[PDB]
Each structure stands twice: as C-alpha cells, then as structure tokens.
C-alpha cells in the first residue's frame, strides 16, 4: 500500500513543501538541514544526531562507554550524498513494509492521529500550540515557515545503534505523562541491525540455520513507532519507574535500566511482569489525566495562531483521546472506550504481535541481549522485499528463516566491530580454591526482579453490597476490523513562530551507572564457569576435548565436553588418512545419538522426559552426574533447576463484610449472588498474581537455561568441527585430492542433530516449569483462597440465618448454593493467564493425569520414600517398616510403635476445610485371620484425627470400615462385605484396591476394585479438623502378628467418579506384567503352584516320570478349616511349576515373554511339552526329561492381554500349537496343549507361591 507517495532522492532540489531545509527547535545554534516529507506529520532527516541536542553535537566515541549491550561508533557515517540516499531509501522501504501489515497499518494510523496537546498556555481558556512541538521549514525564496508535525526520523547519535526516542518538553508540564503528548524524534539507521541467538523456534521449523540470526529492521522500527504511539498519546510511563532488580547476588545482573514502558512496548510475557495493582494504578492515573484533558478542552473556547476554527482542533483531540461528546458538547472519558484504547496501545500495539504478523524470527524476551551488529543494504529489491523481507520467496532463503541467518545469507549481512567489548561491562565471578575468575558479561546473567515491583491489594476487606459487579491473533483481527483508517488529520497553517525555536530535551532521570567489575567469591562451579570451559579460540593447536571443567578453563586449547567418555576418546584419537571419512560418520552418528538421548527411569508422572546431560552441561543442581541429576530431580523437582528460589508471600485475604438488609428478599439474595461472584473474581485474581510471579522468576530462569543449553550444544559441535578440520588439514595434499571432504555437509548434519536435541531440551524445560508452577506456587494461593472461602461460608451462613424472616421457603435453596459452591474449588486454567502455546500444551499434558493432580503421593524413589506431589516436607518413616526388595513401592506396616510414617503436610499449605471433599485410595493386603483374638478387635491402620476430629481407617473380621469423627463426637462409617467362610480366597491375603470418597455435603462412598459397594450419609457430621499429621499405624490391634501390605497411597480433593477410579485401578494394576495368585509380580526360577478356574477343585499331580507318564489331576484338593475362624480350600501341595527364561526385565515377566515351563516332580525338574502325536485338536503334554528335549518344543507365550494368565504354547518353527485346555477327553486328569481355546473358558490359570499370609504348612 502506498504509504510513501513519491520516491525521494537526496540530490533532488528543495521545494518548501515536501523537500526543504528545516530548523528544528534547539538552544545553541541551528544550521538548516534538508528534510523529506513522506506522509502527513512525518519527516525524514538523513543526517547524524548533532543538532537536536546542542550539548551532544559530537560523534566521536565518549571517554566512558555506555551500559547498552552492543555499540559501534563511526565518525564519517551519513556524511556523503550516496550514503544519505541509502539511508532515506531504507527508511522508505521499512515504512512501506510496516504499513503492509494490518497491525503496522493500525499503528501508523494511530501515529498520524496522535497530535500532541496544545496545553502550553498559562491561560486556561486558550489553546496555544507549544513551540517545541513544531519545526521551521525554509522556503526556497528565503522565507521560513513554521509547521506542525508528530514524528521526525533523524539519524543516530555518536553511537550508531542506540536507537532511542527523544522529545522536547515544557518547563513544568510533563507532556509525555499527563496525557498531553509531544513531538518525538527517532534516532534510527536502516543499514545497521543486531543479531540474536535462537533456542525456541525449533519444533515448528526443524531445518533452520545455525550461528546468529539477524533482526528484521522493520521490527526495531515498529518498536520505535510503538514508543511514539505511547508518547504522542501521553500514556508514557514515568522513566523513574524502573523494574527494580536485585544486584548483590553473583548470578544477578549489575543493573538494567528496564522500564515499564519497555515492557509495555514489548508485550507477551514481559508485559505480564506488571502486576495487576500497578497496571490498574496506571489505568486509573491516565484515566484521570484524560479527564483533565477533557476538562481543559471544555474550558478553552479559544485558539490563537490558526486560520481554522476551534471545533476542528476539538475534533482532532477527541478522535485522538477517544473522548465521548454529549448533546451540550461537553467531553467526558468513557471507561469502556478508554479501556479499549489503553488496551490497544498497551498490550496489543506490541512488538511480539508485529513479529507474529511479520512471520519472522525475533528475540522471545527483552532479556535476550544481542552480541553483534550487522551492516545491511536494504535498497535493492533482491536484498529485501516489502512483502517478505530478508526471507526471499521461491528460493532457498524462504524456508526456515534462512534469510536472516548470518552464515547462509552472508551476501546480505556484513559483520561490524563491537566497541562494547564483552569483558568491559562485566560482573566478575571468582571460585576460591588457584583462584578461577571469569569475567562474565553483565548481559549474560540471571534476571532477578525485586519484591517491591510486585504489590497486591488482596489483603483488603471488600464490602459486599447488592449492586456491585486474552489477546490472541483473533482479538487483534477483531480490533483491526473495528479500527478506523480513513480519518486522518490535515496540515493546517499555524502562524509563524520565532526564527530559532528555543527548546531543551526532556531531562531523563540521571541514571546512576552500575559499578562495573563487582567481584564475587564462590565455592561452586556455576553454569557460567561450565559454559566458559566449553569454548575456545580458533587457533591451530590440538583442540582436545576433556571431561573436566577444571582442566578446560586452565587451557585455551582444551574444551570441556559433557558427552560420554567413549565419544571423547573417539574424537581425540589420531586417525589414518584412509580411515578419515569412516571416523567422520562414526563421530556424526555418535554425536547425534548422544544429543538426542532421552532416557533414564520413568518413575514419575509430573515430567515425562528427563534429559541427563543438562546435569553436566549447565551444572543444574550443583552436580555434574547423570544418575545424581535424575535422582535429585525426582527427589526435589524443578526447585534444583532454579538457582534463586522465588518467594511468593500471599497475604491473609480480607474477609468479605456482608451488608445488612431488611424487608428486601431480592436485595438479600443479590447480596449472596454478588458474594459468590466476587469470590470467583478473587480466585481469578490470586491465580493471576501467582502466574505473574512465576512468569517473572521461574520462567526467566528456565529461558536462560534454554539459551545456555543451546550455547553448550553449539560449542560442542564447533569443537568437533574444528578438530575434524585440523585432522583434514594435517594430511598430505595428494590424499586431500583423493578425499573430497566437505565441511558444509558436516556442519549441516551436526546442526540438525543440535536442533533435535533442542526440541528435547525445550520439552523438558517446559515440563519442569509447569511442575514448579503447579507444585510449589498454586497450592500456596489455594490455601488462602480456601481459608477465605471457609470464613465466607461461615459468615454467609450467619447472614442467611439472621435474615430468615424475609426468606421463608427459600432458606434451604440458598443453603444448598452456599454449601455446594464453597465446598467446590475453581479449577486452574492456564489459557486465561498465559497464551504461550508450548507452556499451554505442557499444562494440558500435566492436567490430563490424575496422579500428579493430588495432594499426597507416597512413592519410593532412589532409596527414599518421597511425595511426588509437593505438599509435604517431613515424611518421618519408622525403623520397623519394610519395602519389598523386588518392588520398593511396596510398604508393609507391623504392630510396632515404630512401624509408622509421619506425613506432615506443612501449615503453609493445609487449609481448615481440606477434608470436606476428600478422596483417598490405596492398594491393601489383609492376611488371613488366624487367632480368635481378631474377633471384635477393630483396629485402626490409617489415622488422621489427633484427638477427636478427622478420619480413621479401621478393619473388622471380613469387614473394611471407614470411620469419621467430628468435634461434637458424631461417628459415621461405611462397610465392605466379604466372608472368610468361602472355599476360594477371592479377597483373603490377596491384593485389594480400596478407594474412599468423602462428599461431606451429600454422601461418603467406598470403592473396592473399582466398584461401588456401599455408602452411608455423613451430612449429619460436624466440622472436621484438617490435622497436620497423617498416622500410618495399626493402633488398637491386640494381635501381635498382624500386618498390612499397603501401596499407592493417594489423596485427592474432589469426588472421583466411577470412570476415574476404574482408570486408576487399571493404571496401577500393571497390565503389562503378569501377576501371581496373591496379585504380586510374577517372577522366574521360583516355585509356583497351579490353580484352575473352570474346574477349581482339581488337585494337579503326576502318574509317572518321563514320556511314559503324562500330567495328572488327582481329584479333590482338600479344604482348610478352623472352627469359628475361617473356611477355605487348601491351595498348597501337589506338583510345582517354575518359569524359566528363554528370551533385561530380570525376575519379572511381561506380556508376550517367551519362557520355558519347568515342572518339579519328586525333587527333580522336568519340562512341559509334547511333539510326538500332532493329532486331534490337542497335544498330551508330559514331564519331559533332560535338556535333550530336542524336536519337542516347549516355548510358551503368556498373552497377558486385558483381563486370567493365558498360557499360549508354540512350536520350535514359530507356529502356535495351542492353549493348555483341560482334557477334551473322558478321564479328567491330564494337561494338554489345545488350539481350540485360542479361537470365561478353561484357558485360565493362577500361580500360588509360599505366602506367610496364608499360614498353611
């Protein structure tokens, strides 16, 4: 679109309308300079910054450098006609490019409409234009004319890449802050650009380049134009309002002059650093300023120095500030229109939205600091395009943003020297030992916000009355459709000003330069030391990779490597000339496998993938080991990754005060409705504050971790490439002619391997960030929210009880609403707080699982019993508690005073009404009741009540109980029925899945093996204390040989429906592993008896040893019975089965695991197979002798699908022989292998091991 009408040449003659010599305001002197008018209210001066500041007319480097990240100074720049024409053409092309996009179109239209206020008159009834907001052009016939404008594009200052915005103010009035606005001057250069590293856009565009990525100049120009949009409208935040950051720590930065204006113009995650209190304060402040502008407009009635009328300027300022006019003509600022305008200018007119519309690559956060400046020539169409930019279409450079890479598009970018050396503004770090000091660049350090920037109004008592109360691309499109474009201000003639307009630049607050070179003494090799050990210089000596950070930092040639020692040894070895190439693909493949290595244990649901090499790369957790890193991560979580621990201090939420009302049912129910609604907004506000703190601290630390991982991978790749090049260049010339070796292909394959590893790292770090957010921040806020909800519930119950006179009939319905709504929490939805798609996907993956969304998960990890849900810190296990060596998750409790675990949920997490909506579940094994003492001996195994209020899990003879108790001593129970007087042990000494759901409002339920069985109402119960401790002890058990086998203890917060209980039952049932009769894991090389389902009373025996005798079933099995104690059927005695491995998962069998079946007869082990007949529909199996089985095939597959342990038997040729059916025959005593059952049936068997819980000899 034609943003610039005429194409301008610097050699063109002056006209006095579009091209002329102009005199901008200044103090000392003003020699006229040529200017270029490209559109309304915008002017271009292709001259270096020397005349807008009389004190800063110098272009040489200053004696003292600046606190900016990158700067390069040139004296004879923009001094020649051709170079100035280059500058002008670049600016014109950049304006056209920005105007092409819709957001750019909106921004530029707003810039044109934003005429600064005419409030420089002492007289209140006179709109006098401020002289410093207008310039003096010069006609070709000597006369000079004063003209109004908004923005001027000036060249850069002594520092070329200090792109800044400057303005001329008034003596006492703050033009850019009181909403008046002022003329802005932009110091810019479309031929210089920065370079930023990338570590996040690897999932969408895997096949991207390496090295540095060049910033699109249109992005920086849009940044400056957004600054102009802020300042012309006067909503510019005070420069002294700096986002204060701590400095005293070594890992922090010595200082950043970061302002809320930078955050406002950046957008995205940086804009979320401003807490709701401060942004609401700014909105109210600038709303009052807009009201003041409206009041000034109302009482003006006059303008001096314009041939036009008053209403023209009135309308211009109205269209600017979006004021509302009434019939009388008075102006008022509507809150909705002003909120729309402020939203558009604050969180919509952001650089990130432009980048999303430019479809280019930028720096994700403001904390991403540049390192190099690049010379670019934007004039020719082949180097830059209006529609597409550096990424030229229909060629190589379009895909994967190659047009902005500094190694593939080197014909468009030229590197320039950096005056700001990387070790000039540094924050020195020393590790005491031979002190090891590295001058870490100040712009390569952690971002630590201060606590003062985060202020909350939560600790306040709102008075509840009867009349109280995201921006994706879609909302940007919505405002684009509603935006107004065809209305732009004209250029009216103001009366001639002075010949030289006196003016002075607005005095920015004197920035106290932070003290350079601040030494720190440490005792730990931080991340910076490791990354410094991982780099080198392009010399010519032996670049030998070493696994020691200490030795790497003491030698420039040696480079630290965190990869496996085998790869290090391979890359270091001397290579024969012929074997050069083979070693090249060997190292390429080994490097790719090392980088893409996602491995280690998966005994955690919070984080799906754990990447171990981050351990010895960035020294996360102050350890450099794979196993140590994974173990400490499981033990702690994302806490170890963060270096400084965020400290969120939620205040005690002010109790709502209920206004009393009389003789008004409608008002008194609207009061309760408004209390519930404002409770909803309070939940929203606390969640938002938590999210803001998280994004400020944890996310920034994690992002620095991502960038450092990218740098570590790059350094390893470059070290490998350099040693490969050294080996190539070390050979003889003839051999070099033989070997057509290339370095571009090696670089490309290594870079793609790095990209894949980066995808892995990004997923891992997103998982860790969401882990910390949901584990260590949300519960803290939810505690205060729920305590406030309980206090509010009590107060509302008092209110409704008091006002029952006018609410007869509707008491219970309001009681129902108050009870139901308050006992049910409000779920956490990240889509309402963070719009990052990657973090959102990680959050969705986190919340789709139930194990991680709990409050207590007793799991055994790395020789320690921990809670995967970080809701407790002190789990005090007793000395007389045992874990199964095969499965350490198994935990067994005895009848000892020290067979206990003290689960202490810290008082900073637990709220009072935690056990109102309470759900618990645990797998349990209750052994057979042996002695008569168990009769009427109700023993409690799980205790939560300390004295009188809580829960208490008790068990009776064949009866599982769930006992509750309130303060007033009322007790309600729920019962499961299973009879010990049954022949088969369906539940005795078996594995029982017991789930209890407690809805205090309606009912309490108990679920056994995922089935509803019984429920007794508990709505009559009183208050329940949320005790600090959970007691795991069989207190009240008189039997001295009674124990339980508990595992998988989970506490939830909601009422878990049938579907979720079934899903958790299936998940913890471990369907991928065979189970014995008791439900434990099935093993190898161990005795195991045999049981049958379709014929449960068959006693398996043998008739003869060898092929001459087949397996037998010797009638009844016998029964076990003790009077008035128990009645079952004896399970032991008979033949014995042993599982022998054929084709690791040691001592554990999984689905489709081929094994050898071993049958023990008379202290001798025999094989179970038969390949002698191959007739009928079955094979009469026999106890085969000696490993000379030979042609007979005993391979057995356990098809442990959804369930009954199937026993599929195949041949040595791979074809299936059949299942073990019963007999298909007359005399019922055999064991066969029949294919009929392959196509409840008889193909069902169980294995009984010697269990001490049975007690049968």
Query: What CA–CA distance (Å, rounded) separates 1086 from 1247?
Result: 11
User: What sign does the CA torsion over 1186, 1190, 1193, 1196 have?
Assistant: positive
Work out the angle at residue 81's Cα, subtended by the Cα atoms of residues 78 and 83, and round it to the nearest 5 degrees: 45
- For this experimental structure, what is the resolution in angstroms? 2.8
Bridge partners (DSSP) of residue 534 are none
Query: What CA–CA distance (Å, rounded) separates 4 from 37?
Result: 9
Lay out the sheet containing 901-904: strands in order across.
874-877, 901-904, 1029-1035, 939-943, 950-956, 959-965, 975-977
The token pair that represents 396 in the structure block? 């190589």
| CB-based contacts of 699, cutoff 8 Å, min separation 6 | 269, 769, 839
Query: What CA–CA distance (Å, rounded) separates 1141 from 626?
Result: 31
Query: What CA–CA distance (Å, rounded) separates 446 from 850?
Result: 34
| All domains of the chain in start order, with CATH | 19-421 (3.90.1240.10), 538-844 (1.20.1120.10), 850-1068 (2.60.120.200), 1091-1246 (2.80.10.50)
Range list of β-strands (E), 264-404 = 324-325, 331-332, 372-376
Dihedral, 768, 770, 775, 779 alpha carbons, nearest 10: 160
Look at residues 134, 143, 135, 140 and name the one whose alpha carbon lies nearest to residue 16: 140
Query: What CA–CA distance (Å, rounded) separates 704 from 720?
Result: 24
The token pair that represents 492 in the structure block? 């009216």
**DSSP letter at 1015?**
E
| CB-based contacts of 410, cutoff 8 Å, min separation 6 | none
Q: Is 230 flagged in the annotation as binding?
A: no
Look at residues 987, 933, 1000 and name the one whose alpha carbon lies nearest to residue 960: 987
Active site residues: 224
- Taking phi first (over 0 means left), then psi (-120 to 50 degrees means alpha), and beta for anything else, what does residue 160 get? alpha
| CB-based contacts of 371, cutoff 8 Å, min separation 6 | 69, 70, 195, 197, 212, 418, 422
Look at residues 695, 740, 1001, 1052 and name the one whose alpha carbon lies nearest to residue 871: 1052
By residue count, the chain amounts to: 1257
Range list of β-strands (E), 598-697 = 657-658
Q: Can you list the pairs that 798-807 forms with residues at least 24 positions away whose Cβ atoms lie under 8 Å?
A: 799/658, 799/671, 799/672, 800/672, 802/660, 803/660, 803/661, 803/668, 806/662, 806/663, 806/664, 806/665, 806/668, 807/665, 807/668, 807/669
Burial 1085-1110 (b: 16+ CB within 10 A, else e): eeebbbbbeeeeebbbebeeeeeeeb
Q: Using an 8 Å Cβ cutoff, are 192 and 373 in contact?
A: yes
Look at residues 200, 170, 201 and name the one whose alpha carbon lies nearest to residue 183: 170
Query: What CA–CA distance (Å, rounded) separates 387 from 100?
Result: 7
C-alpha 279 chain-centroid distance: 24
- Could you give phi then psi for residue 872, rounded to 5 degrees? -140, 155
- Could you give phi then psi for residue 21, rounded to 5 degrees? -85, 135
Q: Using an 8 Å Cβ cutoff, are 344 and 354 in contact?
A: no
Q: Using an 8 Å Cβ cutoff, are 916 and 1055 in contact?
A: no
Look at residues 852, 697, 706 and name the one whose alpha carbon lies nearest to residue 779: 852
Query: What CA–CA distance (Å, rounded) separates 976 from 996?
Result: 11
Residue entry with tokens 């996907």: 841
- Spell out the SS3 assignment of 166-234: EEECCCCCCCCCCCCCCCEEEECCCCEEEEECCCCCCCCCCCCCCCCEECCHHHHHHHHHHHHHHHHCC
Query: What CA–CA distance (Å, rounded) separates 517 from 535?
Result: 22
Q: Is 1041 flagged in the annotation as binding?
A: no
C-alpha 875 chain-centroid distance: 28
Look at residues 1248, 971, 922, 867 and name the one whose alpha carbon lies nearest to residue 1090: 1248
Query: What CA–CA distance (Å, rounded) separates 879 from 890?
Result: 16
Q: Is 227 flagged in the annotation as binding?
A: yes
């Amino acid at each position: 679109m034609p943003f610039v009408n005429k194409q301008f040449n610097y050699k063109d003659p002056v006209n006095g309308v579009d091209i002329a010599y102009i005199k901008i305001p200044n103090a000392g002197q003003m020699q006229p300079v040529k200017a270029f008018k490209i559109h309304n209210k915008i002017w271009v001066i292709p001259e270096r910054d020397t005349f807008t500041n009389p004190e800063e007319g110098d272009l040489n480097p200053p004696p003292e450098a600046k606190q900016v990240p990158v700067s390069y100074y040139d004296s004879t720049y923009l001094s020649t006609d051709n170079e100035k024409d280059n500058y002008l053409k670049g600016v014109t092309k950049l304006f056209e490019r920005i105007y092409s996009t819709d957001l750019g179109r909106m921004l530029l239209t707003s810039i044109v409409r934003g005429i600064p206020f005419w409030g420089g008159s002492t007289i209140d009834t006179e709109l006098k234009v401020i002289d410093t907001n207008c310039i003096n052009v010069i006609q070709p016939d000597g006369s000079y004319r004063s003209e109004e404008l908004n923005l001027v594009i000036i060249g850069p200052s002594a520092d070329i890449i200090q792109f800044e915005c400057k303005s001329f103010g008034h003596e006492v009035l703050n033009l850019t802050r009181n909403g008046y606005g002022s003329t802005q001057y932009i110091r810019f250069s479309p031929d210089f650009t920065f370079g930023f590293e990338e570590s996040l856009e690897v999932d969408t565009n895997p096949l991207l380049g390496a090295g540095k990525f060049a910033t699109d100049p249109a992005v920086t120009l849009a940044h400056e134009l957004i600054h102009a949009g802020h300042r012309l409208y006067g909503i510019a935040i005070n420069p002294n309002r700096v986002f204060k950051v701590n400095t005293n720590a070594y890992y922090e930065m010595s200082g950043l002059e970061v302002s809320f204006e930078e955050l406002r113009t950046f957008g995205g995650h940086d804009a979320k650093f401003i807490d709701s209190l401060q942004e609401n304060e700014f909105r109210l402040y600038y709303y009052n300023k807009f009201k003041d502008i409206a009041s000034t407009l109302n009482k003006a009635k006059s303008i001096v120095g314009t041939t036009a009328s008053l209403q023209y300027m009135k309308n211009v300022f109205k269209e600017k500030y979006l004021l509302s006019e009434d019939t009388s003509g008075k102006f008022s600022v509507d809150k909705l229109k002003f909120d729309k305008l402020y939203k558009m200018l604050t969180e919509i007119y952001t650089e990130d939205n432009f980048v999303k519309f430019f479809k280019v690559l930028n720096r994700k956060t403001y904390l991403n600091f540049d390192k190099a400046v690049f010379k670019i020539n934007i004039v020719p169409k082949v180097n830059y395009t209006i529609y597409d930019g550096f990424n030229l279409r229909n060629t190589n450079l379009a895909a994967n943003f190659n047009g902005q890479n500094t190694e593939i598009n080197n014909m468009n970018f030229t590197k320039l020297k950096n005056f700001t050396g990387l070790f000039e503004f540094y924050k020195l770090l020393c590790v005491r030992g031979n002190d090891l000091c590295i001058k870490v660049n100040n712009w390569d350090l952690f971002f630590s916000p201060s606590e003062d920037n985060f202020t909350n109004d939560l600790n306040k008592g709102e008075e509840i009355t009867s009349d109280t109360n995201n921006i994706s691309l879609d909302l940007i499109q919505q405002y684009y459709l509603t935006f107004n474009f065809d209305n732009e201000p004209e250029n009216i003639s103001i009366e001639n000003l002075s010949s030289d307009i006196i003016g002075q630049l607005e005095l920015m607050p004197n920035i106290e330069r932070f003290p350079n070179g601040k030494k720190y003494e440490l005792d730990k090799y931080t991340m910076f030391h490791y990354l410094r050990a991982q780099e080198f210089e392009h010399g010519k000596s032996r670049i030998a990779l070493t696994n020691s950070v200490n030795e790497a930092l003491l030698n420039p040639s040696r480079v630290y490597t965190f990869f496996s020692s085998d790869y290090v040894k391979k890359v270091n070895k001397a290579t024969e000339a012929a074997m050069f190439l083979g070693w090249v693909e060997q190292l390429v493949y080994d490097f790719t496998d090392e980088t893409s290595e996602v491995s280690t244990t998966d005994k955690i649901a919070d984080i799906t993938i754990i990447i171990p090499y981050i351990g010895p790369a960035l020294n996360i957790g102050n350890m450099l080991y794979k196993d140590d890193f994974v173990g400490a991560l499981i033990f702690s979580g994302a806490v170890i990754l963060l270096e400084f621990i965020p400290e969120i201090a939620i205040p005690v939420l002010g109790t709502f005060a209920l206004v009393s009302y009389i003789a008004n049912k409608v008002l008194t129910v609207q009061t309760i409705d408004n209390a519930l609604s404002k409770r909803n907004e309070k939940w929203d506000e606390v969640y938002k504050y938590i999210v803001t703190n998280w994004l400020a601290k944890v996310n920034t630390q994690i992002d620095l971790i991502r960038k450092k991982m990218k740098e570590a991978l790059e350094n390893q790749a470059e070290a490998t490439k350099a040693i490969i090049n050294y080996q190539y260049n070390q050979y003889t010339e003839e051999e070099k002619n033989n070997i057509n070796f290339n370095i571009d292909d090696l670089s490309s394959k290594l870079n793609e391997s790095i990209n894949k590893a980066m995808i892995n790292i990004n997923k891992f770090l997103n998982q860790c960030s969401v882990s910390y957010l949901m584990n260590s921040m949300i519960p803290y806020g939810v505690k205060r929210l729920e305590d406030f909800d309980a206090s509010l519930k009590d107060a509302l119950l008092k209110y409704i009880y008091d006002n029952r006179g006018t609410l007869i009939g509707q008491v219970d319905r309001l009681k129902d609403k108050v009870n139901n709504t308050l006992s049910t929490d409000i779920p956490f939805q990240l889509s309402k707080y963070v719009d990052n798609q990657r973090l959102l996907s990680t959050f969705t993956e986190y919340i789709k699982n139930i194990i991680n969304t709990s409050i207590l998960n007793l799991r055994y990890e790395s020789n320690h019993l921990i809670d995967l849900s970080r809701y407790a810190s002190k789990i005090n296990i007793g000395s007389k508690v045992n874990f199964d060596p095969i499965d350490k998750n198994q935990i067994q409790l005895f009848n000892l005073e020290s067979s206990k675990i003290e689960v202490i949920l810290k008082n900073a997490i637990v709220y009072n009404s935690m056990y109102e909506n309470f759900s618990t579940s645990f797998w349990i094994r209750i052994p057979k009741y042996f002695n008569s003492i168990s009769l009427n001996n109700e023993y409690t195994i799980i205790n939560c009540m300390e004295n009188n209020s809580g829960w208490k899990v008790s068990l009776n003879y064949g009866e599982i109980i769930w006992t509750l108790q309130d303060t007033q001593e009322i007790k309600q129970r729920v019962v499961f029925k299973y009879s010990q007087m049954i022949n088969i042990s369906d539940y005795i000494n078996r594995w029982i899945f017991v789930t209890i759901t407690n809805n205090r409002l309606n009912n309490s339920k108990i679920y056994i093996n995922g089935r509803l069985i019984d429920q007794k109402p508990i709505s009559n119960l009183g208050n329940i204390h949320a005790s600090n401790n959970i007691m795991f002890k069989l207190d009240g058990c008189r039997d001295t040989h009674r124990y339980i086998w508990i595992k998988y203890f989970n506490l939830f917060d909601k009422e878990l429906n049938e579907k979720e209980i079934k899903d958790l039952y299936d998940n913890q049932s471990n369907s991928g592993i065979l189970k014995d009769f008791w439900g434990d894991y099935l093993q190898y090389d161990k005795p195991y008896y045999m049981l049958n389902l379709y014929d449960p009373n068959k006693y398996v025996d043998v008739n003869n040893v060898g092929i001459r005798g087949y397996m037998y079933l010797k009638g009844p099995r016998g029964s076990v019975m003790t009077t008035n104690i128990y009645l079952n059927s004896s399970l032991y005695r008979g033949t014995k089965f042993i599982i022998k491995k054929y084709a690791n998962k040691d001592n554990i069998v999984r689905n489709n695991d081929r094994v050898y079946i071993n049958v023990v007869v008379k202290n001798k082990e025999y094989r179970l197979a038969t390949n002698a007949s191959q007739a009928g529909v079955e094979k009469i199996l026999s106890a085969l002798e000696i490993p000379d089985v030979g042609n007979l095939s005993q391979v057995v597959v356990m098809k442990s699908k959804n369930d009954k342990c199937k026993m599929n038997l195949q041949d040595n040729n791979g074809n299936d022989i059949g299942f073990i059916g019963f007999h298909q025959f007359n005399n019922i005593a055999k064991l066969v292998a029949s294919n009929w059952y392959n196509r409840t049936l008889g193909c069902s068997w169980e294995f009984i091991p010697v269990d001490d819980g049975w007690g049968e000899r």
